[PDB]
Structure formats: C-alpha cells, structure tokens
RNA sequence: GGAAGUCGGCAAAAUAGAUGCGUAAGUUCGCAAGAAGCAUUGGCUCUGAGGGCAAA
RNA sequence: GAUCUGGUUGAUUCUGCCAGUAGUCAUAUGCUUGUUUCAAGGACUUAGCCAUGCAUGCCUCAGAAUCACUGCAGCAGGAAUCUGCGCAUGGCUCAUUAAAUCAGACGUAAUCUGCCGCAAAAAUCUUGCGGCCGCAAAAUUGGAUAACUUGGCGAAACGCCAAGCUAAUACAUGAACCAACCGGGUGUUCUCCACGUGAGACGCCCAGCGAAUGAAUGACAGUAAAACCAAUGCCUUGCAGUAACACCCAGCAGUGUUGACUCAAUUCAUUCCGUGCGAAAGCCGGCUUGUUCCGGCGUCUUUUGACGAACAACUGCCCUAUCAGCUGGUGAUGGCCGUGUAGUGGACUGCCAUGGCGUUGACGGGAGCGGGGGAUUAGGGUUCGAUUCCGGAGAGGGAGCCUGAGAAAUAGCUACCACUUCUACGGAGGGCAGCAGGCGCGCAAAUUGCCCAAUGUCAAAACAAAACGAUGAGGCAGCGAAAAGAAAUAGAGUUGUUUGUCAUUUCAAUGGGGGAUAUUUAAACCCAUCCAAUAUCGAGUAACAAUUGGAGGACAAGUCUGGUGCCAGCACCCGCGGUAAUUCCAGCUCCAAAAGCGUAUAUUAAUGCUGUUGCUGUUAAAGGGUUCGUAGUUGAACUGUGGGCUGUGCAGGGCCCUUGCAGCCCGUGAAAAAGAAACAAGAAACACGGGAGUGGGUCGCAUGUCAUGCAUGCCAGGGGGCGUCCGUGAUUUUUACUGUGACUAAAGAAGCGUGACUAAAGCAGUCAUUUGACUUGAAUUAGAAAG
RNA sequence: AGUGUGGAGAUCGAAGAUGAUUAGAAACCAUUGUAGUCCACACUGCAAACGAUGACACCCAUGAAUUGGGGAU
C-alpha cells in the first residue's frame, strides 16, 4: 500500500532505481486523520508491536496550559483561526499540531481570581468571600507575578488564542498552550 | 549435500609425457624398489616438493625469526624421526638437498628387504600385503608405510602369521582337510 | 573535508579528496566523494574553506552530517 | 526470528565437531550473549561428560540438579556464561566458569563457601521508578541499591546466597584485571594506564606479572583484585600468563618424552 | 453493416474554440507541425498573485 | 622445476602467429572395469509444466472431562473438544538486482522487539447479614460458549445451519479494613501572641505504575571588605557559631548518566472513557496436616538486557562513449509548519529558494545474486564462484490485506492474467524454485527406499511407569568411472637349455569370494575379527584370462606388412597416398598410461603473444601532418655535518677517524636553586569537594548530645608537587609512508602435537590396569582495501 | 588535386579530337585541346604530410669542414 521507502525516489544523480523486491509491511504508511472540530470521534489503530494509535476523527475539548503560570485547564475548542500550512486547513477547521485555535477562557479567569484575587471582569468565584488569611497570600503572589495586558484583554472578551501542541492523529487528543509574549504578537498581525 | 571432509591429491603427472631420460630413470626406480606403477614415484615427488618449498621459505627469514625458529625446528624433527635426514646434519640447509631415493629407503617394503626379512624387494611387498609383518606388534598391510627410526628394531613377523606364533597358513590347512575327508 | 558549494540554504556540499591504491599497478589514483552537510548560521563558511563534520540522524534525503568547525 | 544454529556458525570454544552434528544448541535468550556462552546442554554433555547424548542431557537439566548462581536451571539452551557458579549437589561439583590464557572457557573448581563470592561488572547506571539508583551488570542482573561510589566499569562482588553486594572494586590504574574479549582475553594483568578517547572505544594498557606489555579495548578488561598479588577469587591454572609458543612447544615435547 | 455504391468517397457525414503535455520520416536546417495523438472545460462559494497616489 | 618443441627459406637470422604439451571437486561423450575408503549428483536450457504420498504440530504432579470411553473398586488412564504456544523457523531455487545487494568497520541519543534472564508492585468502597443507613469480614462473583445430544442442509467441499445443556488460566466484574512517608489548593472553622512572610489543630479536593500537554530541576567552577533598611535567626536582657528545616524524622538525598541528551528520574497543573494495569477471584505438591504452614508452577501490567527486526551508510566492487549530458508539470537539491511511521527522512501535503549529479565517466545499455572461497600460479597475476556457511530475494505473473511481537507470509486469505482438475452443471477446487517421482527441454544430471538411533526445531514437555510427541529438517542405505586416498592380477626355488631367456619339478601364502560364537548398526547393509577355542571352506592356464591410443617429426615405439594407386583413407600442425605407402586398411612386437585411457568444448599455465614487475613502434603490425592547449600525470636547489673527556682499532695523513662509556643551557649569550635562554596544547594562568573509596604526596579528650552525633578532629601553618573537572590564553598542523598493537565467524589454505595399521582425514586420545592421574590436548598463523 | 563566386588565360595541360604503333592500343610517341594551371575572397583537411625515427631533460670518443653572433691577436 502506502510505503515510506526510498525505492520509488530518483537517485541524487537523477537515475531510476530498479526495484528487485516486493513491498514490505515494515515500511508501510497510513491514511491521515484529517481531524476536524466536532463531537469526539476517534478510531484506534493497531500499530507495530501491539501498541495502539488513536486516530482522532473529530475533537472538541483538550487541556490548554498557561505556560507563564504553569497552570493547565480543560477547555472546549471554539475555532481554529490560523494554519501555517494552508488556508484550506483553517477553512475546513482541521486540527493539526501547531495550528492556532481559540478556546474558552472561562477556567483561566476563574483560576486567576482564585489565585491572585484580581477579577478581570471586575457558581462564579467571589473574591470578597475569601477568609482574611487568604489576602495575605494574594499580596505575596501579586508582587511575584505581573500579567500582560494582551492576554488579560483576551480573558475579558471570553476567548483566548492558543496553539495546539499535541498530534491529534497520533495521540487522539488536542492539547495546547495559550499564546504569550512575542508569539502572540506575531499571530495577531496575521489575524488582523 | 552438507558433507564436510576434505579429499585432496597426492601426486602430479610429469609436464613432458615422453622423455627418454625420465622414462628410463623412472623404470630403474620401479624395478630397483618394486613399485606397481609410476604413481608411487609421483607421490614421492609431490611429498619431496612440499618439504622443499616450505624449507625454501624458511631459509629467507632470519635465524631468530619465531616462525623460522618454530617451523624450522619442527621440520628437523620430522626429518630425523622418519630417518630422512642424518642426525648429525642439524642445519636447515640439509633438508633442501633431500633426494627421491632417500624417501623410498624408509618405505616398509624397502626396510623389510634390507633387514634380511625379505630376500627381494618384490618378496617384501607381497609379504606385507599378506599380513605377515607387524610393526610394534601391529599388523601393517601397506608397502608404503614410512617407518620411524625408533620403530626399526620392532619390525618382525606378526604373531598371527604362519611364520611365527600363529596358526598354519592356507596350504597346510586346505590339504589337511583333503586328507581327513578322503578317510 | 573542504567546502565545495554553499548555494543552498543552511546546507553545504563538501568534498573528501583521497588517493585510492590500485594493487596490481602498485600506484594510486585521485578520487573524491561528495557529502551534503547541514551548516548552522553560527559558522558562515565560504567556498574552498575547511570544515569538520559529525554524523547525525537523517536530516533530509541526503543529509547525515552536521558542521562542527570552520577552518 | 531464527531458532536454528548451524554447526559451523556455532562458537569455536564449544568444541563440537563438524562431522557429528549438522545443528547446534541455539542458546535461548538470557543472561549472556549466544556468542559468549556455553549452553547448559553443551556444558553438561561435552565438558562434564555426565550426559552421553542430548536426550540424556535434558534428563539432568529438567530434574533441577544443575544450579546456576544458587538457582536451578532446566533449559538446555540456558546461556550460563562467564563468571557464574555452577553447582550440582548430587556430585558436589561447585565450580565457576573462567577464561584461560588461550581465551577458552574453564571450569575452575571452587572451594566451600567460595561459591557465595561472585563478581559482576557494572555496564550501566540509571534510576528506576521513585529515584532508585540501579546498576545492571554483565550477567543481566539489576542491583536495586548499589554502593554510592559505584560507577560504570567497576565490578561489585555479589553474594549469590544472600543476594546482596558485599564490596566494590573501582576501575583505576594499578588494579588486577582479566581480559574478556579477543585473543588477549583470559590474561590477568595490571592496569598501568588507560587512554580515554571520547566517542570511540577506550584503550586499556596492561602489564602482567611476567612483565609483558599488552593492550586491549577497555570494554574487555574485568577487575579481579585490588592488586596483581592478591586476587579475590581463584583463577584458571595458568595464572593468567601466556608464555612463548616456542617454549610452549618445547616443554610439552619434553613432558611427553618423560612419560616414555 | 460501413464504400459492398460509383469511372472515381461525387455528395453527405466527420474533425473543430482555448489551455497543458506530446509529436515521425525527410530537409535547402528555415521547416515538416495544428504532424500524429492524450487530457481539461460548467455553476457557485472562497483563497492567493499581479498596482497607483499621498504621509517624515 | 622461474623449462619449452614442430610449421615461412635452396640454406640463414628474426618477427609473428598456428599447432603441440601439463592441470581443472570441469562438463558431455566413446572404450574398459577385480578390492576398499571418501564422495558431487535436473544449476547451465525452460524462476518450463506437473499425478500421487509425506513434509508443523504439540500434554504432565502441575488450564479445562459426566465420552451413555477403558480397567479396578470413587480411583487411575483417557479419545474428542475448547484454551495456550508454534507454523515469519527449517528446506529449495538464483529469476530480479550496480550510490541496489554484499564484505570489513561504524551507528540508531531515529526506533520496534513474543519466547528467555534479572528485577519492581501500598491506585481501586468489595462481600454476607434487617430496614442509602447499621453490624461483620481467609471475598463462598457473573453470564456465555466449546465438546456432547437432537433435527439436519448439501453431489461434493481443509462445506454448512437451528435448538438444549456444560467448564475453565476463554470473557467480564471486583476486592473497604488490616496498610506508611510525602506536597499542593483551601475553610468568611476553632485555640492563642502583638494588635500580621503570625503559629497550632481539625473538616474536604486532589496527591499509585504508565501514557498526553505545559512549568521547574536534571549544577557552579576568571574578585576582596564595609555600611543601610525591612524581615527572620541567635547571645544577653550586638554579631560569635552556623548545614537545611516553625516538631512529633534535631542529615528519611543541596549530588542519575553519557563524550554529548529536549534522555533517566523527581515535584507541580490539567487529562486518560477501550485504545492500558487482578493477589488470574488460577493449578499442583509436601509434612507438624495449620480462619498467619511451606514449596513448585502459572498469569495481567511496569522495566532493562539478551535473542532478533528495521533504517542509515566510511572504503571497495565487471564490459560499454557506435551511450554526454542526467533530474526538476505530477519531488528533482535544500528550507519552514505539518502529516504518516515503530522511528529519522521529500516518505508524503501546502508554501518558499534554484538547486543536486557528471569525462575522477553521470544518464543509458549489456552480462551477472554478493562474499567466505575453487583452479592455476617463481613472483606479479589470470580465471571461476547457481551450489553445503553467512547476507539478500522469490514461491506461475502482478498487486492488496487479516492475524500476530514479528509476514505485504503463499503446503494464509482476496482480486485480475495465463494455464488448469472434479462435478449430480447448481457449483467447488490448484500452485513441487521441499522430499520421493513424471512430461518436455536439452550435450547434460539418482529411489515414489528406511528411520527419528545421533544433531537440532517446536512443544503444555526430563526418563520411567495403561503412560513410546512431530520432523521427506536431518541421519542411514540404493543408483552413481564428477572427483579424491590406500591398493589385486602373484612370491621363491632344484635340473637341463658369469649371467639372463625357455621347458621342468615343486614349495609355501594371502586376498577376491563362502560362511559365523558372533561384531557393527534404531534395524539393516558396509567395513573390522575368525576358518575353532573340543569342533569352522576354499587359486595353477593360480581362465579368479587389462584396456585405450599409437610406432615419419614434434613425441616413447618397426629396413614386417598386403592391397588401393592423389582413390579409399589418415592427418590437432608439418605432411602420407599417382603400382616396391614412412602416415591408408591388419598380425606380431614394441611403446606410453594403467582400473583406467581417448575425443569435444571452456578455462589456467605455457604467453615477456596485454608486459605494474615486464613487450613492441627506422625497414616486420604500430609516432598523430604541424603548432597551441585545458582536465590529467610529472615537476629544480635551499632552513640540516652537534661538540668535550678516558680507553680502544696494521686506522690514516699535535689533527682527523671506527667501537664502547660518562658529560654537555646539546650554537651564542645569560646564571641552571631561582631567574634567564631554549622549549614545552601531553603547556601555562585563574578557578571549583558534588575533585582524591572521608580533601592525594609532601586511646581518652576538644566539638555537640531530645540525635545509631555510635558523628567530626586529634598537627599548627607555609610552600610547592601532582590524579580529576571547568573557563581563559600558541599571528594554533595534518596526511601518505613506515614500526608496533587493538578489532576481526566457522568451513577452506599454511602450520605445533597426534603411528586413526599408512594415506586422503579427525581433534583426538595416551598410561597404570584401574573404582583415577595427564589438575590431558584441541597451539600458533596469513586472510585485500578501508576503519 | 578538387569546390563556389569574380577576374585572368601567355606556357603547359586531366577529359576530348586527330595521326602513328600494334594482333588489339580514344596507352606509351606526335599535333592540338576543355577544366585546370595564375590572382582575390570563402571552402576542403584525404600526401612516400618521411628522418617511414613523438616531445622535454642528462651523459657521451675522434678528424676535416660549414652557417649566424661574440672574445683575443
Ligand atoms: K580443496
Ligand atoms: K556510542
Ligand atoms: K468502422
Ligand atoms: K474502374
Ligand atoms: K493538434
Ligand atoms: K487455540
Ligand atoms: K520535519
Ligand atoms: K542461503
Ligand atoms: K600399422
Ligand atoms: K612494482
Ligand atoms: K612525425
Ligand atoms: K600543347
Ligand atoms: Mg466532398
Ligand atoms: Mg525528427
Ligand atoms: Mg616469408
Ligand atoms: Mg595451442
Ligand atoms: Mg529461510
Ligand atoms: Mg541472472
Ligand atoms: Mg559469489
Ligand atoms: Mg542461471
Ligand atoms: Mg518471501
Ligand atoms: Mg514452477
Ligand atoms: Mg505472496
Ligand atoms: Mg509447495
Ligand atoms: Mg497464485
Ligand atoms: Mg523434487
Ligand atoms: Mg607396403
Ligand atoms: Mg590432442
Ligand atoms: Mg592462458
Ligand atoms: Mg601472459
Ligand atoms: Mg611466465
Ligand atoms: Mg611482441
Ligand atoms: Mg611498417
Ligand atoms: Mg624536490
Ligand atoms: Mg653554551
Ligand atoms: Mg581448517
Ligand atoms: Mg577554381
Ligand atoms: Mg598530349
Ligand atoms: Mg596519414
Ligand atoms: Mg610513420
Ligand atoms: Na468505393
Ligand atoms: Na622448404
Ligand atoms: Na603487340
Ligand atoms: Na623520405
Ligand atoms: Na645562420
């Protein structure tokens, strides 16, 4: 079937390789996932050695991590907005590694209030309910940490840009991290 | 199919098939030493060539060469023990001058005749062929048995042969059966 | 080897010139071999220069070496 | 994978003739490489001669009589390589496997309680789960808690009965080592200096008791004592000295003559 | 069915636009050549590429 | 053994070929064949086509039996059938195949890995009792489905349905307490201190292996003193000492590894949805027979290390230019983000930049599986290698795929093309380049034999006992003048005709062969032993009869024949034959080899007629018509006599000079401690205990004591000297060659030892006769190039 | 020698013509004669293109000469 050998390729001299061997299972290839946004549909693949590969067909949620805070939360995927390969992957909403997506920013807002006592908007967490011992902890953390305006404005709007760091067609999940620093400012120009 | 034992060759035919000098010299060695054909001589020639070639190699190396010191000493022991070379001839250069008649001199058919056991060298061959001689009390039935010097005193008649400690031979046996039956 | 061509991007071609001994004729003959080597932006070599290369994993169809020095 | 081992492809140290067998006992995986091991059938039949055939060899082994490192083994294809204590309680053999000066395997007979003393060379140092330093040895054993000073290239003397290490010998210059690879293998010598070439193999320059200067790759030496004078365990009968071949020839010819 | 019609493919049929690939003998080297031959073509909704002017 | 000879001329000396000559495990063929050992054997051409039978199956103390199975009297066997493992190994063949395969040498830190070795394991709200609650605890879990029975369908099919039970170590579920250390987030919770980096308890939310994503570790190693302020340690009511720590732990880690890691491992945050994890909720044995008995197994996860797999490539590898350009739409060389893979990678998608290879021969074409190796050879070489060991590939041609750890598997499946077989015509089958064996093809190549006795493979498994696994792999035979070793066809006499031939008279001996008390052998056959041990057959034309080519020369052997009459013929070459044939067609004799000898075709030597060693070019074949001229090859001298002293050589013309020893800052300077001058990267200047097995050479008393503090010191200091590690510094020095060494499968070739009766072999065996020595031996080599 | 285009065309002269010789003799001999032969430009690249002897470098015995440049008288 699909092979990953170099027998079909031309030599660097441009010559044609005369193949004297039939195709081998140790050099096969599989058809790509083409994972799209949707309700979770996956397909296991019996890889070599008995291990199973999870070919994800559709995905909707994944763990997205705030790198500057060493924090990660499970959020739902709202949209895919950029793909360095082609526009056709954005237009079809195909989830691949390194593709820029928009996720729900609610858990990162809830965590920030629970941690630093700064409600960006200011069930829902209330800062004033916290016992007076906690504000001492918040003051110690507030001097240690200072957040960026570009990210904070994204929390206020409700959607935050992110970058997928997992391979959906290999692991079966779409995890990522939030765009911080110059990386975020790089992609804002393209999206604008 | 997957059989793993060597089978080499021990002789070589002469390069010039018809030399009057070589044919007459080889015929002299046949009658004088009692050989069935010329292949015994050509076997001797190949035997002597091999010692000559390796000796030729040894004399090129220095006398302190470990290969020369070891293989040179070994080939001296092979020459002396089999009687090819005289024991006082200790140098490695005396192996080179070895001759064809020297090798056949150590053949059992030759030694049997020379010891007084066989009146003729042709008597020796058939006598050996008839299991009549034992070397170190071991029956030898092969004329080309090259004998060592240390085993020369052990040459005798086999204790099973009629000429010795054995039962009577065929003629004294078959005719005796004839007389008993005729009774 | 010696840098032979720097016309690609982050990649150079080097030449390993050597003498091969023909046993029958008791003489040598000049032979050369070409290698595609990945060159980091830390080096910036030129044609005719001298480099030291080290074997790495397959980086492309032809690249199996990485530049370690430029002389 | 392959299961057969041809007679010619078998190691030469096993001393099986090319005329008797077409095949050889293919050593099943285990503690030692199949190139560096004597199958327990080969050991029990061709070396100890307790077994006449291979069918009589499985009789001995399946019974659990043959013990290796204080453990009975039943498979005839068991590797049973170098520096292992083999015990058969029915006959009380209690010998260990060593390399003689000519590089071949030797059944060095051991004394009582010397079987507990056994050595093994550390080949890799790594942490297991839970930050546990682990050392794997040439026998394939994994030491769960080694000495804090133990490094790769050192040999730990390990109690087979107690299943516990008792002492460590660090790989430094001025130690007694026995070579395990090549034609130099089987020679006990003293490390005079080790040349370290990063990436490539390391060269170990040695000097035995007689004063011969020989070398080999550092992956073949095996520390056997703190110094050449005193060794932890018994060694083959030649004492690890390879003497000249010409003098090897002269003495055996004299000894053969002394019989007559 | 396919030139069997007829002096004779007369007459009719047939090929066909554009784009890509490909193209033989022969040759006065200019050609032959649109040689011969394969392939695509619509409608919609998009995405790229190809510019002018003004501002320290 | 480093060798030649015949043919050009009337004769001569050359060049040069033809012919001769020896070998080939080199094929065929013709003639001939008594003994024994050791043997190749449908490769060449048709990877042409094939009947049959067999070749991969497996069970014991240890997964499962209610056979309406057997024997005994519940026990022991146990067919069938589920379950588990294997069938991806072996064995054939050589068609494909030139930056491919392969050889030697390196990698995988770019990965996968059943069986085998050694280790690790604290996740889990379960079950029995009354109405989620209470009591209690050796967990007394649940549905299937095989076999089997019934009905059967079907011509058959290594074809099939429906219904009833019934298990397992098949499938699923699930074990709270017994049972820890450990941290993070918290509470508008309670006790306190002064009036918040405050402290302590308690409630709940997570804190198991592995996998996914992110954050921190996964070390520093080119400086010496003071203030100042806030907080926190201490002494006592201002900084000397001092690990870290706000306790139940007063050192329960400030320290993984490699040459190098984004690796190992640890902590923190989110996550695992079938695509993971039981103490198989398992089996069997022993005694003291035990709600804690002790072993042998077996298995699910995790882990690495062995056996493998796959990928990459440092050097090498035939002929051809009447093959000079090759590649790049639609991947060619590279880059970026991805995808796919077990993993790297243009392997593949999108987008960028024009690269990459070539007269050092690319591209194309032709012949070939590649080595280890064979033949021949003074040396250098030439040639063969389908073929037993290793690597690759294939199973009529192609192509896809399931299972499985591993297959693009073919005595597995699916499809198409060629062929094909059975059929009840509805339909169903096949793949000998496995063994044995057919037809065609050819110049050309064995028996449908015996056996698992050895060697091994698989397997649930030692052997034995109702109890004996499979094996056309393999071993042992039949056929077998491929080839190779030892060897028959006779040995002596007295008389007559110095020896010698011939006719006599005999004499003893062994084998071929006939057999056995028997030996060998799985059983046989073969070899070895014997012809009685009281008792074992046989050679005189020893008919138990040796052939194939020759007799002008090369080339050993005839004035013999007899015919033909340039005919019939021979003759490898020269030549013979036209009526007294040197050659023709026969006898004798003789020659040569001999159980062997001709012929044909290849190949090696001969051949210095392919010449590197090592050819020839005036006239024999062969200097280009002449210049220029790139690749290519080749390329001029020069950094350079080391000196002194003692003794010594037929030295020689106080000096020079061989040999041996001790000196030399070993030119000159400047003083061998220092400094100076030469050098010295294998050096020098800093600078690191997590650098040196406790910081390398050079018996009670100080610390401290809620400490296994049971710990530390017991020279103080200085000075240099060094084994390790890091940084900074040489206006930075390699390669060929040569000497040593490491690395490197056997079979094959040398070679030590070895009376297998010898030899072609093999790695054995020898000795005292002994309840075992030799602490038996199984040496050493070479094996291109590259590394 | 031959080719192309322009010239030139005295001599000689392939082809051709005529006369001899001859068995024959558009062969040798004789008389003529076209292309050529000569020039300019452009082709061709075929010689007993020879010393049947490749180029560069070193050593190398004798006597009489010869061509060009030097030095001495
Ligand atoms: K051979
Ligand atoms: K390495
Ligand atoms: K038509
Ligand atoms: K017509
Ligand atoms: K057209
Ligand atoms: K099964
Ligand atoms: K990539
Ligand atoms: K093979
Ligand atoms: K005749
Ligand atoms: K040479
Ligand atoms: K010339
Ligand atoms: K004229
Ligand atoms: Mg018309
Ligand atoms: Mg054309
Ligand atoms: Mg002539
Ligand atoms: Mg010839
Ligand atoms: Mg195979
Ligand atoms: Mg072929
Ligand atoms: Mg080959
Ligand atoms: Mg073939
Ligand atoms: Mg295959
Ligand atoms: Mg076939
Ligand atoms: Mg197939
Ligand atoms: Mg088959
Ligand atoms: Mg088929
Ligand atoms: Mg067959
Ligand atoms: Mg006659
Ligand atoms: Mg002949
Ligand atoms: Mg030849
Ligand atoms: Mg030659
Ligand atoms: Mg020669
Ligand atoms: Mg010649
Ligand atoms: Mg000539
Ligand atoms: Mg020079
Ligand atoms: Mg001086
Ligand atoms: Mg051998
Ligand atoms: Mg003209
Ligand atoms: Mg005229
Ligand atoms: Mg010419
Ligand atoms: Mg010439
Ligand atoms: Na018509
Ligand atoms: Na003549
Ligand atoms: Na005439
Ligand atoms: Na001339
Ligand atoms: Na002149």
PDB file of N, CA, C and O (backbone and C1' of nucleotides) and ligand atoms in Angstrom, chain G residues 11-13 31-33, ligand 12:
ATOM      1  P     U G  11      50.289  29.879 -75.472  1.00  0.00           P
ATOM      2  O5'   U G  11      51.331  29.062 -74.593  1.00  0.00           O
ATOM      3  C5'   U G  11      52.730  29.236 -74.752  1.00  0.00           C
ATOM      4  C4'   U G  11      53.476  28.616 -73.600  1.00  0.00           C
ATOM      5  C3'   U G  11      53.168  27.150 -73.333  1.00  0.00           C
ATOM      6  O3'   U G  11      53.944  26.278 -74.135  1.00  0.00           O
ATOM      7  C1'   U G  11      53.033  28.371 -71.313  1.00  0.00           C
ATOM      8  P     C G  12      53.286  24.980 -74.808  1.00  0.00           P
ATOM      9  O5'   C G  12      52.935  24.032 -73.580  1.00  0.00           O
ATOM     10  C5'   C G  12      53.950  23.368 -72.841  1.00  0.00           C
ATOM     11  C4'   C G  12      53.428  22.889 -71.511  1.00  0.00           C
ATOM     12  C3'   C G  12      52.340  21.828 -71.564  1.00  0.00           C
ATOM     13  O3'   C G  12      52.860  20.518 -71.707  1.00  0.00           O
ATOM     14  C1'   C G  12      51.709  23.542 -70.063  1.00  0.00           C
ATOM     15  P     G G  13      52.054  19.399 -72.527  1.00  0.00           P
ATOM     16  O5'   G G  13      50.679  19.237 -71.739  1.00  0.00           O
ATOM     17  C5'   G G  13      50.600  18.537 -70.504  1.00  0.00           C
ATOM     18  C4'   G G  13      49.290  18.813 -69.809  1.00  0.00           C
ATOM     19  C3'   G G  13      48.051  18.224 -70.472  1.00  0.00           C
ATOM     20  O3'   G G  13      47.811  16.893 -70.052  1.00  0.00           O
ATOM     21  C1'   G G  13      47.687  20.519 -69.980  1.00  0.00           C
ATOM     22  P     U G  31      54.684  17.571 -80.906  1.00  0.00           P
ATOM     23  O5'   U G  31      53.396  18.106 -81.670  1.00  0.00           O
ATOM     24  C5'   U G  31      53.405  18.311 -83.074  1.00  0.00           C
ATOM     25  C4'   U G  31      52.016  18.582 -83.590  1.00  0.00           C
ATOM     26  C3'   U G  31      51.191  19.564 -82.775  1.00  0.00           C
ATOM     27  O3'   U G  31      51.502  20.911 -83.072  1.00  0.00           O
ATOM     28  C1'   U G  31      49.883  17.661 -83.286  1.00  0.00           C
ATOM     29  P     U G  32      51.106  22.075 -82.042  1.00  0.00           P
ATOM     30  O5'   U G  32      49.524  22.169 -82.173  1.00  0.00           O
ATOM     31  C5'   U G  32      48.711  22.508 -81.063  1.00  0.00           C
ATOM     32  C4'   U G  32      47.322  21.946 -81.215  1.00  0.00           C
ATOM     33  C3'   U G  32      46.324  22.337 -80.140  1.00  0.00           C
ATOM     34  O3'   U G  32      45.742  23.604 -80.389  1.00  0.00           O
ATOM     35  C1'   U G  32      46.188  20.005 -80.562  1.00  0.00           C
ATOM     36  P     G G  33      45.579  24.676 -79.208  1.00  0.00           P
ATOM     37  O5'   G G  33      44.398  24.092 -78.320  1.00  0.00           O
ATOM     38  C5'   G G  33      43.118  23.834 -78.877  1.00  0.00           C
ATOM     39  C4'   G G  33      42.335  22.888 -78.009  1.00  0.00           C
ATOM     40  C3'   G G  33      42.273  23.254 -76.537  1.00  0.00           C
ATOM     41  O3'   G G  33      41.258  24.203 -76.259  1.00  0.00           O
ATOM     42  C1'   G G  33      42.875  20.982 -76.752  1.00  0.00           C
TER      43        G G  33
HETATM   44  K1  LIG H  12      50.004  21.957 -76.403  1.00  0.00           K
END
